[PDB]
Amino acid sequence: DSSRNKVKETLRLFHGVCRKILQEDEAKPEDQRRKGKGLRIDFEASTILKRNGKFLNSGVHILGEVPGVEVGDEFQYRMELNILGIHKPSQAGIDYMKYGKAKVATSIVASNSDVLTYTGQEDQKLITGNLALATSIEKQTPVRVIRGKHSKGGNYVYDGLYLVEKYWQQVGGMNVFKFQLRRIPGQPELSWVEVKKSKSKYREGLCKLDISEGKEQSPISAVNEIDDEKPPLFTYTVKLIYPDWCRPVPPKSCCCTTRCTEAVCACVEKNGGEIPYNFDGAIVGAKPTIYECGPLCKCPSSCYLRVTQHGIKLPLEIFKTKSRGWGVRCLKSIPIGSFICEYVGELLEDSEAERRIGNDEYLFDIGNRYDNSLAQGMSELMESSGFTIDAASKGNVGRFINHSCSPNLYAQNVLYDHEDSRIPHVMFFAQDNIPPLQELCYDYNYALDQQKLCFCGAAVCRRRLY
Ligand SMILES: C[S@@+](CC[C@H](N)C(=O)[O-])C[C@H]1O[C@@H](n2cnc3c(N)ncnc32)[C@H](O)[C@@H]1O
Ligand SMILES: [Zn+2]
Ligand SMILES: [Zn+2]
Ligand SMILES: [Zn+2]
Ligand SMILES: [Zn+2]
């Protein structure tokens, strides 16, 4: 609830600190850098959050559901599990707590879909963690299972609550304990099961293979498992449509022959003397404006300042919701800070967009969307436009992204093929590690009374869309 938002914002803060530390290391000459030394940005970020009182459920073990943590949630670092109190050991696979005179397991990190076999702990002994997991069988107390998928992206997934049914002992060439767990009925489906079904021959609800019809480099399918509706009529466009008096003037370019770096390069200077992306392509954090290198920059395509201009990289699809029409999701998980897509449509003066008929549901009002909340919290740890994008008649997949009061995306202004700040590119970025098939949403930011109810379903919902 408030708990859900607290959890998400705590993880967001953590990754913000990680990527700021990394940004500061990447700003150094490639021998003053510590990443080789075995810099540990997750460890350092964890220490910073700890000293500033940001850990949740600290000093206590929890049996069963953890408030604000949901089945399917993903984590990049094991340390995130400790920050949230999901799983306390930094390395050990089994976490446990006192229970009556005994100890029972609270959580395991694990490397017929409701059934799981888990390997324990040079013979293994029935002590500590192994003994606790064994005791879970007798008490029939719940165990949280965190599944390791195997580096940016979700590496761990919360798969929910399980019961331990039995254990046995076998040669691993020394002796090991093995445990069989079974998922408690009534929980949301495992995300790996949902993904498996989405990859099927006969996948239910498939309406259209490609709503772009060949224009996108990768097809964007449409799925409807709710009703018989097919996707709405519109002309798919991967290119912005400019008025003629707004066609791009050649921007200032940089003379760098190698990839651009900083804390010489004009484009680094545009960004305030720093690189707004990490070297792995993820955005460090939202800013009012990001300047990418342009067509005449001497730098290679691999330039750290060339990200959103390369277009969609993720496998997107549109799908039917029960109460908000069509929305957008991704067939795989999305690492925090990843570029999603642009909001593409016709660029119009606000007055022109307003005058036109039938387009009100597909307008992106440019400007005043930078949220500096995170920048502020992080500092504690250590402009307007007269233009609108009309995607009603002509637009890309961006027109289908719904609103949420607790969104997993945000809009980011980007300039690269021109310097006209009145009409920046509107680029969406992830602000969570997003589970596969989770609906993608951002804050529409409509002012109330300039009525329509908000159906985003968040616990902190502001109740009205406008
Ligand atoms: C840009 S369209 C998004 C795609 C749209 N759902 C469709 O089927 O084409 C914006 C419209 O989606 C609906 N919508 C988006 N988010 C909503 C929300 N949180 N609550 C209620 N309706 C929403 C509203 O009808 C809104 O006018
Ligand atoms: Zn440069
Ligand atoms: Zn440049
Ligand atoms: Zn460059
Ligand atoms: Zn809402």
Swiss-Prot record:
Zn(2+) 1 binds at residues 254-256, 260, 265. Zn(2+) 4 binds at residues 405, 454, 456, 461. Zn(2+) 3 binds at residues 260, 293, 299, 303. Keywords: Centromere, Chromatin regulator, Chromosome, Metal-binding, Methyltransferase, Nucleus, S-adenosyl-L-methionine, Transferase, Zinc. It is found in: Nucleus; Chromosome, Centromere. GO terms for biological process: methylation. Its EC number is 2.1.1.-, 2.1.1.367. It catalyses: N(6)-methyl-L-lysyl(9)-[histone H3] + S-adenosyl-L-methionine = N(6),N(6)-dimethyl-L-lysyl(9)-[histone H3] + S-adenosyl-L-homocysteine + H(+); L-lysyl(9)-[histone H3] + S-adenosyl-L-methionine = N(6)-methyl-L-lysyl(9)-[histone H3] + S-adenosyl-L-homocysteine + H(+). GO terms for molecular function: histone H3K9me2 methyltransferase activity; methyl-CpG binding; methyl-CpNpG binding; methyl-CpNpN binding; methyltransferase activity; zinc ion binding. Its main location: nucleus. S-adenosyl-L-methionine binds at residues 324-326, 360, 362, 399, 402-403. Disulfide bonds: none annotated. GO terms for cellular component: chromosome, centromeric region; nucleus. Residues 64-183 form the YDG domain. Residues 252-311 form the Pre-SET domain. Zn(2+) 2 binds at residues 254-255, 267, 293, 297. Belongs to the class V-like SAM-binding methyltransferase superfamily. Histone-lysine methyltransferase family. Suvar3-9 subfamily. Histone methyltransferase. Methylates 'Lys-9' of histone H3. H3 'Lys-9' methylation represents a specific tag for epigenetic transcriptional repression. Seems to act preferentially on dsMRNA. Although the SET domain contains the active site of enzymatic activity, both pre-SET and post-SET domains are required for methyltransferase activity. This is Histone-lysine N-methyltransferase, H3 lysine-9 specific SUVH6.
